[PDB]
Amino acid sequence: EIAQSGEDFKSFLDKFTSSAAFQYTRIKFPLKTPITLLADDGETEKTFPFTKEKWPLLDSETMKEERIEQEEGGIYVSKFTLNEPVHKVFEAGYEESEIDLRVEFEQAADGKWYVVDCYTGWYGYDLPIGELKQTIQQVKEENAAFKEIHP
Ligand SMILES: [Cl-]
């Protein structure tokens, strides 16, 4: 569960979520899994590299493990589904739905933690390819908000 050398994961994650500049330094772009969307033709899958300009900054609230029971009926669950000394995977989503976030963390040979892959519902398979550019701009605007409180 806990690494015997290098960076402590919980301490890393607190720094990662508290500073945008630091966060960007600890993501290995392009991520392992590219963004995959269906073309308008309705048959061809198109991939786009998951690069720095597309990254939605992750805050401390998002990275908390918890179970949210909503009055309107949903149960939203976030948890580390893999929790090994040098390899962790965080998943979040509504119970009985597909997940809307998966973040994969690995402690590299230098002892530092990095994000090496991510699935985010911002770029879900349900996103029309024609909306990708504007979605990326929306993420930029969210990131501007993040940077007002977590530079
Ligand atoms: Cl409730």
Side-chain angles (χ1 to χ4, degrees), residues 1-9 11-45 47-151:
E1 191 187 357
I2 194 169
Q4 306 295 312
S5 62
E7 280 180 354
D8 176 76
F9 181 77
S11 184
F12 154 80
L13 189 62
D14 285 346
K15 195 180 185 182
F16 184 89
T17 54
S18 78
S19 171
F22 179 76
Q23 182 162 147
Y24 282 122
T25 72
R26 295 306 192 81
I27 303 165
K28 289 182 160 330
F29 296 110
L31 298 174
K32 284 198 284 179
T33 304
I35 295 159
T36 302
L37 308 172
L38 252 203
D40 292 341
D41 80 347
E43 39 178 33
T44 310
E45 290 183 323
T47 64
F48 302 82
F50 200 154
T51 51
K52 183 188 166 188
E53 92 283 8
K54 298 187 185 75
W55 179 253
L57 293 161
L58 295 173
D59 70 16
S60 60
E61 294 79 6
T62 295
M63 296 300 317
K64 274 214 199 330
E65 293 189 279
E66 69 196 3
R67 180 180 152 95
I68 304 166
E69 283 170 321
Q70 300 176 327
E71 187 278 343
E72 283 167 353
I75 301 177
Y76 194 84
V77 176
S78 56
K79 64 191 170 162
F80 284 92
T81 52
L82 183 72
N83 186 22
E84 304 288 334
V86 300
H87 191 195
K88 301 191 196 293
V89 176
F90 182 82
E91 274 176 25
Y94 282 102
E95 274 187 359
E96 318 199 347
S97 292
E98 186 60 88
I99 63 164
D100 59 27
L101 179 67
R102 180 195 186 272
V103 190
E104 183 174 24
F105 299 93
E106 291 188 341
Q107 194 196 54
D110 63 7
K112 295 181 177 179
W113 288 97
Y114 296 86
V115 170
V116 299
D117 207 3
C118 175
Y119 169 77
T120 174
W122 274 108
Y123 309 119
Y125 192 81
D126 291 341
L127 185 69
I129 194 159
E131 294 184 359
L132 180 57
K133 189 163 245 193
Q134 190 43 41
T135 299
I136 292 168
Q137 177 61 33
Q138 288 166 9
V139 168
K140 183 180 179 164
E141 290 158 8
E142 299 285 341
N143 287 345
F146 185 105
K147 289 187 283 187
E148 292 288 349
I149 47 173
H150 305 305

mmCIF file of all heavy atoms in Angstrom, residues 22-59, unseen atoms left out:
data_model
loop_
_atom_site.group_PDB
_atom_site.id
_atom_site.type_symbol
_atom_site.label_atom_id
_atom_site.label_comp_id
_atom_site.label_asym_id
_atom_site.label_seq_id
_atom_site.Cartn_x
_atom_site.Cartn_y
_atom_site.Cartn_z
ATOM 1 N N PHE A 22 2.733 23.342 -10.747
ATOM 2 C CA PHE A 22 3.300 22.058 -10.331
ATOM 3 C C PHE A 22 2.588 20.892 -11.016
ATOM 4 O O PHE A 22 3.224 19.937 -11.498
ATOM 5 C CB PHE A 22 3.229 21.894 -8.816
ATOM 6 C CG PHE A 22 3.781 20.594 -8.320
ATOM 7 C CD1 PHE A 22 5.138 20.385 -8.250
ATOM 8 C CD2 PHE A 22 2.927 19.548 -7.942
ATOM 9 C CE1 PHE A 22 5.636 19.185 -7.779
ATOM 10 C CE2 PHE A 22 3.421 18.337 -7.477
ATOM 11 C CZ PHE A 22 4.784 18.160 -7.401
ATOM 12 N N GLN A 23 1.255 20.946 -11.034
ATOM 13 C CA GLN A 23 0.472 19.888 -11.662
ATOM 14 C C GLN A 23 0.935 19.581 -13.097
ATOM 15 O O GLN A 23 1.152 18.418 -13.466
ATOM 16 C CB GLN A 23 -1.031 20.230 -11.621
ATOM 17 C CG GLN A 23 -1.887 19.137 -12.224
ATOM 18 C CD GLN A 23 -3.379 19.165 -11.871
ATOM 19 O OE1 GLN A 23 -4.198 18.782 -12.698
ATOM 20 N NE2 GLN A 23 -3.734 19.619 -10.660
ATOM 21 N N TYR A 24 1.090 20.633 -13.904
ATOM 22 C CA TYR A 24 1.532 20.436 -15.278
ATOM 23 C C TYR A 24 2.902 19.752 -15.378
ATOM 24 O O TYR A 24 3.142 18.929 -16.279
ATOM 25 C CB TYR A 24 1.590 21.751 -16.041
ATOM 26 C CG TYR A 24 0.267 22.267 -16.517
ATOM 27 C CD1 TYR A 24 -0.181 23.513 -16.120
ATOM 28 C CD2 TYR A 24 -0.520 21.515 -17.381
ATOM 29 C CE1 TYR A 24 -1.379 24.015 -16.559
ATOM 30 C CE2 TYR A 24 -1.731 22.016 -17.848
ATOM 31 C CZ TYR A 24 -2.140 23.259 -17.427
ATOM 32 O OH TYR A 24 -3.324 23.753 -17.835
ATOM 33 N N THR A 25 3.775 20.013 -14.426
ATOM 34 C CA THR A 25 5.117 19.373 -14.436
ATOM 35 C C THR A 25 5.070 17.888 -14.118
ATOM 36 O O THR A 25 6.040 17.170 -14.388
ATOM 37 C CB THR A 25 6.132 20.031 -13.448
ATOM 38 O OG1 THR A 25 5.829 19.742 -12.076
ATOM 39 C CG2 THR A 25 6.266 21.536 -13.676
ATOM 40 N N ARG A 26 3.962 17.420 -13.526
ATOM 41 C CA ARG A 26 3.832 16.023 -13.110
ATOM 42 C C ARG A 26 2.851 15.205 -13.926
ATOM 43 O O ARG A 26 2.289 14.222 -13.451
ATOM 44 C CB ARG A 26 3.501 15.954 -11.632
ATOM 45 C CG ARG A 26 4.587 16.477 -10.734
ATOM 46 C CD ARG A 26 5.944 15.818 -10.981
ATOM 47 N NE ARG A 26 6.858 16.155 -9.904
ATOM 48 C CZ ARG A 26 6.888 15.560 -8.714
ATOM 49 N NH1 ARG A 26 6.098 14.531 -8.416
ATOM 50 N NH2 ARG A 26 7.728 16.006 -7.804
ATOM 51 N N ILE A 27 2.677 15.595 -15.177
ATOM 52 C CA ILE A 27 1.885 14.828 -16.106
ATOM 53 C C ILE A 27 2.765 14.505 -17.302
ATOM 54 O O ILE A 27 3.416 15.400 -17.844
ATOM 55 C CB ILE A 27 0.641 15.595 -16.565
ATOM 56 C CG1 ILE A 27 -0.199 16.004 -15.341
ATOM 57 C CG2 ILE A 27 -0.153 14.703 -17.511
ATOM 58 C CD1 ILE A 27 -1.254 17.055 -15.615
ATOM 59 N N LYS A 28 2.823 13.225 -17.666
ATOM 60 C CA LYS A 28 3.634 12.792 -18.806
ATOM 61 C C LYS A 28 2.806 12.790 -20.096
ATOM 62 O O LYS A 28 2.117 11.832 -20.398
ATOM 63 C CB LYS A 28 4.261 11.424 -18.537
ATOM 64 C CG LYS A 28 5.381 11.482 -17.489
ATOM 65 C CD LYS A 28 6.037 10.130 -17.253
ATOM 66 C CE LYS A 28 7.429 10.233 -16.613
ATOM 67 N NZ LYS A 28 8.185 11.472 -16.966
ATOM 68 N N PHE A 29 2.877 13.895 -20.831
ATOM 69 C CA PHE A 29 2.182 14.070 -22.090
ATOM 70 C C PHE A 29 3.048 13.576 -23.244
ATOM 71 O O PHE A 29 4.267 13.730 -23.197
ATOM 72 C CB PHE A 29 1.865 15.554 -22.324
ATOM 73 C CG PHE A 29 0.915 16.152 -21.316
ATOM 74 C CD1 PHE A 29 1.357 17.098 -20.365
ATOM 75 C CD2 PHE A 29 -0.435 15.819 -21.326
ATOM 76 C CE1 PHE A 29 0.471 17.669 -19.446
ATOM 77 C CE2 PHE A 29 -1.310 16.378 -20.416
ATOM 78 C CZ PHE A 29 -0.859 17.311 -19.470
ATOM 79 N N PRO A 30 2.419 13.037 -24.306
ATOM 80 C CA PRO A 30 0.983 12.811 -24.442
ATOM 81 C C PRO A 30 0.602 11.610 -23.627
ATOM 82 O O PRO A 30 1.422 10.716 -23.409
ATOM 83 C CB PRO A 30 0.793 12.529 -25.941
ATOM 84 C CG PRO A 30 2.124 12.058 -26.406
ATOM 85 C CD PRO A 30 3.149 12.750 -25.560
ATOM 86 N N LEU A 31 -0.614 11.604 -23.097
ATOM 87 C CA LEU A 31 -1.006 10.522 -22.215
ATOM 88 C C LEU A 31 -1.090 9.209 -22.982
ATOM 89 O O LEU A 31 -1.182 9.194 -24.218
ATOM 90 C CB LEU A 31 -2.322 10.850 -21.517
ATOM 91 C CG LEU A 31 -2.258 12.095 -20.627
ATOM 92 C CD1 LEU A 31 -3.646 12.420 -20.113
ATOM 93 C CD2 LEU A 31 -1.278 11.915 -19.482
ATOM 94 N N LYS A 32 -1.041 8.109 -22.246
ATOM 95 C CA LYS A 32 -0.981 6.789 -22.864
ATOM 96 C C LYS A 32 -2.168 6.503 -23.788
ATOM 97 O O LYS A 32 -1.991 5.927 -24.863
ATOM 98 C CB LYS A 32 -0.853 5.693 -21.809
ATOM 99 C CG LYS A 32 0.546 5.586 -21.227
ATOM 100 C CD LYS A 32 0.781 4.251 -20.539
ATOM 101 C CE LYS A 32 0.104 4.186 -19.182
ATOM 102 N NZ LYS A 32 0.322 2.869 -18.513
ATOM 103 N N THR A 33 -3.357 6.935 -23.394
ATOM 104 C CA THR A 33 -4.554 6.684 -24.195
ATOM 105 C C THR A 33 -5.006 7.984 -24.853
ATOM 106 O O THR A 33 -5.314 8.963 -24.172
ATOM 107 C CB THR A 33 -5.686 6.102 -23.335
ATOM 108 O OG1 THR A 33 -5.220 4.921 -22.683
ATOM 109 C CG2 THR A 33 -6.920 5.763 -24.193
ATOM 110 N N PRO A 34 -5.047 8.011 -26.197
ATOM 111 C CA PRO A 34 -5.513 9.232 -26.846
ATOM 112 C C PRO A 34 -7.029 9.400 -26.733
ATOM 113 O O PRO A 34 -7.739 8.489 -26.318
ATOM 114 C CB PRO A 34 -5.122 9.021 -28.312
ATOM 115 C CG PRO A 34 -5.163 7.551 -28.498
ATOM 116 C CD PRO A 34 -4.735 6.952 -27.179
ATOM 117 N N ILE A 35 -7.512 10.578 -27.086
ATOM 118 C CA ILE A 35 -8.931 10.847 -27.134
ATOM 119 C C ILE A 35 -9.453 10.174 -28.400
ATOM 120 O O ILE A 35 -8.904 10.414 -29.452
ATOM 121 C CB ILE A 35 -9.181 12.369 -27.140
ATOM 122 C CG1 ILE A 35 -8.715 12.982 -25.794
ATOM 123 C CG2 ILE A 35 -10.651 12.697 -27.370
ATOM 124 C CD1 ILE A 35 -8.441 14.472 -25.846
ATOM 125 N N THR A 36 -10.500 9.355 -28.281
ATOM 126 C CA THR A 36 -11.120 8.657 -29.418
ATOM 127 C C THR A 36 -12.580 9.102 -29.566
ATOM 128 O O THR A 36 -13.393 8.915 -28.664
ATOM 129 C CB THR A 36 -11.131 7.128 -29.252
ATOM 130 O OG1 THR A 36 -9.798 6.663 -29.093
ATOM 131 C CG2 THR A 36 -11.734 6.445 -30.482
ATOM 132 N N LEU A 37 -12.891 9.655 -30.732
ATOM 133 C CA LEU A 37 -14.242 10.153 -31.059
ATOM 134 C C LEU A 37 -14.758 9.506 -32.386
ATOM 135 O O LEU A 37 -13.940 9.072 -33.196
ATOM 136 C CB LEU A 37 -14.169 11.672 -31.194
ATOM 137 C CG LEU A 37 -13.522 12.440 -30.016
ATOM 138 C CD1 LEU A 37 -13.334 13.910 -30.354
ATOM 139 C CD2 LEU A 37 -14.329 12.325 -28.740
ATOM 140 N N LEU A 38 -16.071 9.403 -32.598
ATOM 141 C CA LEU A 38 -16.624 8.949 -33.902
ATOM 142 C C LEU A 38 -16.712 10.143 -34.828
ATOM 143 O O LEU A 38 -17.235 11.178 -34.428
ATOM 144 C CB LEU A 38 -18.036 8.354 -33.762
ATOM 145 C CG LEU A 38 -18.329 6.870 -33.893
ATOM 146 C CD1 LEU A 38 -19.794 6.679 -34.263
ATOM 147 C CD2 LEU A 38 -17.433 6.208 -34.921
ATOM 148 N N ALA A 39 -16.272 9.986 -36.066
ATOM 149 C CA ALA A 39 -16.471 11.041 -37.069
ATOM 150 C C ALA A 39 -17.955 11.211 -37.413
ATOM 151 O O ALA A 39 -18.797 10.376 -37.067
ATOM 152 C CB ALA A 39 -15.673 10.757 -38.336
ATOM 153 N N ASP A 40 -18.285 12.324 -38.056
ATOM 154 C CA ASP A 40 -19.664 12.562 -38.491
ATOM 155 C C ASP A 40 -20.171 11.457 -39.437
ATOM 156 O O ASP A 40 -21.350 11.123 -39.409
ATOM 157 C CB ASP A 40 -19.778 13.923 -39.182
ATOM 158 C CG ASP A 40 -19.563 15.078 -38.229
ATOM 159 O OD1 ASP A 40 -19.676 14.878 -36.992
ATOM 160 O OD2 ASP A 40 -19.262 16.180 -38.731
ATOM 161 N N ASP A 41 -19.277 10.896 -40.256
ATOM 162 C CA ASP A 41 -19.602 9.762 -41.132
ATOM 163 C C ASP A 41 -20.236 8.568 -40.403
ATOM 164 O O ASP A 41 -20.867 7.711 -41.024
ATOM 165 C CB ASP A 41 -18.365 9.327 -41.947
ATOM 166 C CG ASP A 41 -17.383 8.466 -41.164
ATOM 167 O OD1 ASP A 41 -17.473 8.358 -39.929
ATOM 168 O OD2 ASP A 41 -16.485 7.889 -41.804
ATOM 169 N N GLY A 42 -20.027 8.486 -39.091
ATOM 170 C CA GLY A 42 -20.729 7.514 -38.249
ATOM 171 C C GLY A 42 -20.055 6.149 -38.198
ATOM 172 O O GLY A 42 -20.594 5.217 -37.606
ATOM 173 N N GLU A 43 -18.863 6.045 -38.778
ATOM 174 C CA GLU A 43 -18.126 4.766 -38.824
ATOM 175 C C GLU A 43 -16.664 4.885 -38.392
ATOM 176 O O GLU A 43 -16.136 4.007 -37.697
ATOM 177 C CB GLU A 43 -18.212 4.131 -40.234
ATOM 178 C CG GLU A 43 -18.117 5.112 -41.370
ATOM 179 C CD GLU A 43 -18.156 4.451 -42.741
ATOM 180 O OE1 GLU A 43 -18.832 3.415 -42.896
ATOM 181 O OE2 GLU A 43 -17.519 4.988 -43.666
ATOM 182 N N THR A 44 -16.000 5.963 -38.796
ATOM 183 C CA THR A 44 -14.565 6.087 -38.571
ATOM 184 C C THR A 44 -14.262 6.632 -37.197
ATOM 185 O O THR A 44 -14.733 7.701 -36.855
ATOM 186 C CB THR A 44 -13.930 7.018 -39.619
ATOM 187 O OG1 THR A 44 -14.349 6.621 -40.930
ATOM 188 C CG2 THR A 44 -12.403 6.966 -39.539
ATOM 189 N N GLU A 45 -13.451 5.923 -36.420
ATOM 190 C CA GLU A 45 -12.985 6.477 -35.150
ATOM 191 C C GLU A 45 -11.760 7.335 -35.409
ATOM 192 O O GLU A 45 -10.883 6.967 -36.195
ATOM 193 C CB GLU A 45 -12.657 5.382 -34.159
ATOM 194 C CG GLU A 45 -13.885 4.641 -33.653
ATOM 195 C CD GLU A 45 -13.549 3.597 -32.605
ATOM 196 O OE1 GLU A 45 -12.495 2.943 -32.717
ATOM 197 O OE2 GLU A 45 -14.330 3.440 -31.652
ATOM 198 N N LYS A 46 -11.720 8.500 -34.779
ATOM 199 C CA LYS A 46 -10.629 9.421 -34.983
ATOM 200 C C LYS A 46 -9.991 9.617 -33.616
ATOM 201 O O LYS A 46 -10.697 9.792 -32.626
ATOM 202 C CB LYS A 46 -11.137 10.744 -35.539
ATOM 203 C CG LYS A 46 -11.439 10.705 -37.034
ATOM 204 N N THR A 47 -8.667 9.544 -33.583
ATOM 205 C CA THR A 47 -7.938 9.760 -32.351
ATOM 206 C C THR A 47 -7.258 11.104 -32.395
ATOM 207 O O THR A 47 -6.887 11.627 -33.459
ATOM 208 C CB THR A 47 -6.891 8.670 -32.012
ATOM 209 O OG1 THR A 47 -5.867 8.657 -33.004
ATOM 210 C CG2 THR A 47 -7.523 7.295 -31.894
ATOM 211 N N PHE A 48 -7.139 11.681 -31.215
ATOM 212 C CA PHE A 48 -6.417 12.916 -31.032
ATOM 213 C C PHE A 48 -5.510 12.726 -29.816
ATOM 214 O O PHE A 48 -5.969 12.247 -28.787
ATOM 215 C CB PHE A 48 -7.387 14.062 -30.759
ATOM 216 C CG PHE A 48 -8.411 14.263 -31.832
ATOM 217 C CD1 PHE A 48 -9.577 13.490 -31.894
ATOM 218 C CD2 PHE A 48 -8.204 15.216 -32.807
ATOM 219 C CE1 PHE A 48 -10.498 13.684 -32.924
ATOM 220 C CE2 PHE A 48 -9.118 15.404 -33.839
ATOM 221 C CZ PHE A 48 -10.271 14.647 -33.890
ATOM 222 N N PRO A 49 -4.234 13.113 -29.928
ATOM 223 C CA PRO A 49 -3.332 12.944 -28.782
ATOM 224 C C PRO A 49 -3.824 13.729 -27.575
ATOM 225 O O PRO A 49 -4.274 14.862 -27.717
ATOM 226 C CB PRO A 49 -2.006 13.534 -29.274
ATOM 227 C CG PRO A 49 -2.085 13.468 -30.761
ATOM 228 C CD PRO A 49 -3.533 13.658 -31.106
ATOM 229 N N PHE A 50 -3.717 13.133 -26.396
ATOM 230 C CA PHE A 50 -4.118 13.813 -25.176
ATOM 231 C C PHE A 50 -2.906 14.593 -24.668
ATOM 232 O O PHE A 50 -2.081 14.085 -23.925
ATOM 233 C CB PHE A 50 -4.633 12.799 -24.161
ATOM 234 C CG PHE A 50 -5.511 13.391 -23.078
ATOM 235 C CD1 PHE A 50 -6.446 12.596 -22.463
ATOM 236 C CD2 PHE A 50 -5.367 14.706 -22.641
ATOM 237 C CE1 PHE A 50 -7.239 13.099 -21.448
ATOM 238 C CE2 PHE A 50 -6.166 15.216 -21.631
ATOM 239 C CZ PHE A 50 -7.107 14.416 -21.039
ATOM 240 N N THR A 51 -2.828 15.844 -25.095
ATOM 241 C CA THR A 51 -1.682 16.698 -24.870
ATOM 242 C C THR A 51 -1.997 17.791 -23.842
ATOM 243 O O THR A 51 -3.126 17.903 -23.348
ATOM 244 C CB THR A 51 -1.264 17.364 -26.193
ATOM 245 O OG1 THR A 51 -2.414 17.969 -26.781
ATOM 246 C CG2 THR A 51 -0.702 16.342 -27.153
ATOM 247 N N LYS A 52 -0.970 18.564 -23.496
ATOM 248 C CA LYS A 52 -1.058 19.527 -22.393
ATOM 249 C C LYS A 52 -2.180 20.525 -22.571
ATOM 250 O O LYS A 52 -2.871 20.868 -21.608
ATOM 251 C CB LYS A 52 0.266 20.267 -22.224
ATOM 252 C CG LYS A 52 0.281 21.237 -21.058
ATOM 253 C CD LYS A 52 1.531 22.103 -21.037
ATOM 254 C CE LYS A 52 1.345 23.270 -20.070
ATOM 255 N NZ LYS A 52 2.440 24.276 -20.130
ATOM 256 N N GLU A 53 -2.378 20.992 -23.790
ATOM 257 C CA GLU A 53 -3.405 22.009 -24.017
ATOM 258 C C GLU A 53 -4.828 21.469 -23.747
ATOM 259 O O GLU A 53 -5.743 22.243 -23.543
ATOM 260 C CB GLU A 53 -3.270 22.658 -25.410
ATOM 261 C CG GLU A 53 -4.074 22.000 -26.508
ATOM 262 C CD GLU A 53 -3.458 20.712 -27.013
ATOM 263 O OE1 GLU A 53 -2.474 20.237 -26.408
ATOM 264 O OE2 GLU A 53 -3.976 20.169 -28.021
ATOM 265 N N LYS A 54 -5.018 20.156 -23.777
ATOM 266 C CA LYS A 54 -6.318 19.539 -23.527
ATOM 267 C C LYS A 54 -6.571 19.175 -22.067
ATOM 268 O O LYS A 54 -7.686 18.839 -21.703
ATOM 269 C CB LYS A 54 -6.466 18.279 -24.391
ATOM 270 C CG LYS A 54 -6.418 18.565 -25.892
ATOM 271 C CD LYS A 54 -6.740 17.329 -26.714
ATOM 272 C CE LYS A 54 -6.571 17.584 -28.204
ATOM 273 N NZ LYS A 54 -5.138 17.626 -28.612
ATOM 274 N N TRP A 55 -5.534 19.223 -21.237
ATOM 275 C CA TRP A 55 -5.629 18.756 -19.853
ATOM 276 C C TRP A 55 -6.540 19.598 -18.956
ATOM 277 O O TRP A 55 -6.287 20.774 -18.775
ATOM 278 C CB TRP A 55 -4.237 18.727 -19.206
ATOM 279 C CG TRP A 55 -4.253 18.276 -17.783
ATOM 280 C CD1 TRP A 55 -4.069 19.050 -16.663
ATOM 281 C CD2 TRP A 55 -4.500 16.943 -17.324
ATOM 282 N NE1 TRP A 55 -4.191 18.272 -15.528
ATOM 283 C CE2 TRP A 55 -4.461 16.977 -15.905
ATOM 284 C CE3 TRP A 55 -4.781 15.731 -17.975
ATOM 285 C CZ2 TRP A 55 -4.666 15.843 -15.135
ATOM 286 C CZ3 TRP A 55 -4.973 14.606 -17.200
ATOM 287 C CH2 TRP A 55 -4.911 14.670 -15.800
ATOM 288 N N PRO A 56 -7.584 18.978 -18.373
ATOM 289 C CA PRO A 56 -8.337 19.663 -17.312
ATOM 290 C C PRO A 56 -7.650 19.526 -15.957
ATOM 291 O O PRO A 56 -7.499 18.411 -15.459
ATOM 292 C CB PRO A 56 -9.692 18.921 -17.290
ATOM 293 C CG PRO A 56 -9.654 17.972 -18.464
ATOM 294 C CD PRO A 56 -8.209 17.700 -18.708
ATOM 295 N N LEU A 57 -7.320 20.653 -15.336
ATOM 296 C CA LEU A 57 -6.692 20.647 -14.038
ATOM 297 C C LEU A 57 -7.604 20.034 -12.976
ATOM 298 O O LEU A 57 -8.792 20.370 -12.905
ATOM 299 C CB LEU A 57 -6.255 22.067 -13.667
ATOM 300 C CG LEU A 57 -5.119 22.643 -14.533
ATOM 301 C CD1 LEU A 57 -5.063 24.156 -14.419
ATOM 302 C CD2 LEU A 57 -3.770 22.052 -14.160
ATOM 303 N N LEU A 58 -7.011 19.160 -12.164
ATOM 304 C CA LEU A 58 -7.716 18.400 -11.125
ATOM 305 C C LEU A 58 -7.499 19.014 -9.749
ATOM 306 O O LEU A 58 -6.369 19.300 -9.366
ATOM 307 C CB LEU A 58 -7.203 16.973 -11.095
ATOM 308 C CG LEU A 58 -7.518 16.198 -12.367
ATOM 309 C CD1 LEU A 58 -6.824 14.856 -12.307
ATOM 310 C CD2 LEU A 58 -9.017 16.040 -12.597
ATOM 311 N N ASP A 59 -8.594 19.266 -9.032
ATOM 312 C CA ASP A 59 -8.505 19.872 -7.711
ATOM 313 C C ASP A 59 -8.661 18.872 -6.585
ATOM 314 O O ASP A 59 -8.933 17.701 -6.830
ATOM 315 C CB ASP A 59 -9.474 21.056 -7.595
ATOM 316 C CG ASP A 59 -10.934 20.662 -7.559
ATOM 317 O OD1 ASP A 59 -11.281 19.482 -7.331
ATOM 318 O OD2 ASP A 59 -11.770 21.580 -7.734
#
